[PDB]
Amino acid sequence: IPTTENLYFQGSMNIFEMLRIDEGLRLKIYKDCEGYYTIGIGHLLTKSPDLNAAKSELDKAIGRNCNGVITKDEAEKLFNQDVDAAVRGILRNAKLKPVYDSLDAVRRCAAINHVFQMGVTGVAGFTNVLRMLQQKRWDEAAVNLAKSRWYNQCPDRAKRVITTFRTGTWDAYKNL
Numbered sequence: 001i002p003t004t005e006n007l008y009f010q011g012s013m014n015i016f017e018m019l020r021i022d023e024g025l026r027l028k029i030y031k032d033c034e035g036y037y038t039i040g041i042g043h044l045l046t047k048s049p050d051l052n053a054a055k056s057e058l059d060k061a062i063g064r065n066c067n068g069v070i071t072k073d074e075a076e077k078l079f080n081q082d083v084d085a086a087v088r089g090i091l092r093n094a095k096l097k098p099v100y101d102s103l104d105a106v107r108r109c110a111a112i113n114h115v116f117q118m119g120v121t122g123v124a125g126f127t128n129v130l131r132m133l134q135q136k137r138w139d140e141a142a143v144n145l146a147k148s149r150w151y152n153q154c155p156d157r158a159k160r161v162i163t164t165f166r167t168g169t170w171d172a173y174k175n176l
Contacts (some may be wrong), residue, residue: 002154033154040075
């Protein structure tokens with residue numbers, strides 16, 4: 001039985017806290033599970049193997065000379081920008097918006113997370129999953145998500161998102 005504290009947990013979770021868990025928080029340029037230069041909270045700098053391109057993109061995104069290092073406040077501002085971009089990317093897209101609209105609040109967070117991670121065209125190409133979600137076929141959607149390269153090449157970053165699509169609860173984010 002959920003305790004009073006347990007019942008409060010869902011109000012502490014939102015898309016920012018969700019992606020923060022999946023992406024982590026790093027103040028220095030690093031390589032993600034696919035070897036792509038990344039910083040902050042899952043901000044992909046470039047797909048280039050050239051660290052110099054990544055640092056260039058960094059200074060562009062932050063607006064100062066960073067030399068590969070940012071502050072927590074800066075990470076958070078960039079993260080906020082990226083979350084907004086993912087939400088906007090869903091809402092303007094004729095394929096993703098109807099699916100998003102059909103989902104409950106927690107699965108909506110999973111959708112924004114999915115888009116943040118894969119980008120709009122990658123997600124919008126998941127024809128079967130999108131249909132399953134619209135039809136509330138949660139088990140099937142989750143099994144199909146678990147076939148994707150997105151999940152399989154980097155399972156720890158995607159696994160909680162898939163669980164959340166399956167359940168529409170925050171359970172995968174409890175007890176880290």
